[PDB]
Write an enzyme that holds these catalytic residues in place. Structure first.
Site, short mmCIF file in Angstrom:
data_model
loop_
_atom_site.label_atom_id
_atom_site.label_comp_id
_atom_site.label_asym_id
_atom_site.label_seq_id
_atom_site.Cartn_x
_atom_site.Cartn_y
_atom_site.Cartn_z
N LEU A 191 -49.48 -8.62 -31.43
CA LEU A 191 -50.83 -8.42 -32.01
C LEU A 191 -51.39 -7.06 -31.58
CD1 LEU A 191 -52.39 -12.03 -31.70
CD2 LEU A 191 -51.55 -10.93 -33.84
N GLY A 192 -50.92 -6.55 -30.45
CA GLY A 192 -51.32 -5.23 -29.96
C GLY A 192 -51.55 -5.18 -28.47
N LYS A 193 -52.03 -4.02 -27.96
CA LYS A 193 -52.35 -3.80 -26.54
C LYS A 193 -53.87 -3.95 -26.37
CE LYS A 193 -51.27 -0.92 -22.52
NZ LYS A 193 -52.28 -0.01 -21.91
N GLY B 115 -51.30 -4.35 -20.61
CA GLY B 115 -50.43 -5.44 -21.06
C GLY B 115 -50.30 -5.50 -22.56
N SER B 116 -49.95 -6.68 -23.10
CA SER B 116 -49.84 -6.86 -24.56
C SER B 116 -50.40 -8.22 -24.94
CB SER B 116 -48.38 -6.76 -25.00
OG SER B 116 -47.63 -7.81 -24.40
N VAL B 117 -50.76 -8.38 -26.21
CA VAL B 117 -51.26 -9.63 -26.78
C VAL B 117 -50.27 -10.02 -27.86
CG1 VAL B 117 -53.23 -10.89 -27.76
CG2 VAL B 117 -53.66 -8.88 -26.29
N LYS C 283 -52.07 -13.18 -23.86
CA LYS C 283 -52.01 -11.90 -23.17
C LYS C 283 -51.14 -12.04 -21.90
CE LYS C 283 -53.95 -8.54 -20.38
NZ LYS C 283 -55.03 -7.81 -19.67
N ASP D 228 -65.52 -1.12 -22.23
CA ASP D 228 -64.62 -0.68 -23.31
C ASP D 228 -65.13 -1.18 -24.66
OD1 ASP D 228 -62.23 0.68 -24.07
OD2 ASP D 228 -60.96 -1.06 -23.75
#
Ligand SMILES: *CCC(=O)N1CC[C@H]2CCN(c3ncnc4[nH]ccc34)[C@H]2C1
Length: 271
Positions: free
Chosen positions: A14-16, A17-19, A38, A126
């Site tokens: 799914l995208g950024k 660790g990573s998901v 995650k 963020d």
């Protein structure tokens, strides 16, 4: 609340660790529910400690405007999966379909999520359209709590040792100059999110593209620009009232920025 590793079936990134998108499939027949999971890919007790901190923060947040914590797998943080994905890509994909009222609805929901986070003494650090998820055409949720920190009871800001690794265009001047983060620097970032919403995240006038065009290290050049009072331009066709709220979020001094409690009713009135 406790997910067995053997039953979490890998589907895709799914995208950024990573998901990763996983199916929690205890029946092993491809009928189980989809979840966003995650995990870290790098050891070190610090990244592991930072990860454990994120899980403790998310688990204790209960809001319609914050991504839902589902549990852990012993290692992995399990959250609800929102197939519409991040607000940034959603806005690009749906630009010709979403009107000013819809953008104001998302702004109000993000503001409410932020007011709640502030009530929990949580600084997100963020906030950006790429870190907000779309639950449906009329509902968004804040996600990506990997940089979030809880403020101690006697201190309303935090100082980070090493400067940020995130794109510099969302940081408040005090974060750029002194690595200071607070609920007030999250208000500055929210002003950048209002800009992203009102540009539909168009890459040509994005915070990076526009600040670099307006702009010696780049961080120092941006800090110089902001200190001079220069700001991102009002987005094309932006309602005047919305552009005025952005400028208030971008007050040079953190104490002069409106609070999320003050912003909420104003966004609701415009909507
Ligand atoms: C802008 C690309 C995008 O859709 N995303 C950025 C990369 C990850 C970060 C978290 N994430 C995600 N997607 C869907 N459901 C989720 N539930 C928790 C985290 C989720 C992607 C969003």
């Amino acid at each position: 609340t406790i997910f067995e590793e053997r039953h979490l079936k890998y589907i895709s990134q799914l995208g950024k660790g990573s998901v990763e998108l996983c199916r929690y499939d205890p029946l092993g027949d491809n009928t189980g529910a989809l979840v966003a999971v995650k995990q870290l890919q790098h050891s070190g007790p610090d990244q592991q400690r930072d990860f454990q901190r994120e899980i403790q923060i998310l688990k204790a947040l209960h809001s319609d405007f914050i991504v839902k914590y589902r549990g852990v797998s012993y290692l992995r943080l399990v959250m609800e999966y929102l197939p519409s994905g991040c607000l940034r890509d959603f806005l690009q994909r749906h630009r010709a379909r979403l009107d000013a009222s819809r953008l104001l609805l998302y702004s109000s929901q993000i503001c409410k999520g932020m007011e709640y986070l502030g009530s929990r003494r949580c600084v997100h650090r963020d906030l950006a359209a790429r870190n907000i998820l779309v639950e449906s055409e009329a509902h968004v949720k804040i996600a990506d709590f990997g940089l979030a920190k809880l403020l101690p009871l006697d201190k309303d800001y935090y100082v980070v040792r090493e400067p940020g690794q995130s794109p510099i265009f969302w940081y408040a001047p005090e974060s750029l100059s002194d690595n200071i983060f607070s609920r007030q620097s999250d208000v500055w970032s929210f002003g950048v999110v209002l800009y992203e919403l009102f540009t539909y995240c168009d890459k040509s006038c994005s915070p990076s593209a526009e600040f670099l065009r307006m702009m010696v290290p780049a961080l120092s050049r941006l800090l110089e620009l902001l200190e001079e009072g220069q700001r991102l331009p009002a987005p094309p066709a932006c309602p005047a009232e919305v552009h005025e709220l952005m400028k208030l979020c971008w007050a040079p001094s953190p104490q002069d920025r409106p609070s999320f409690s003050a912003l909420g009713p104003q966004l609701d009135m415009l909507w």
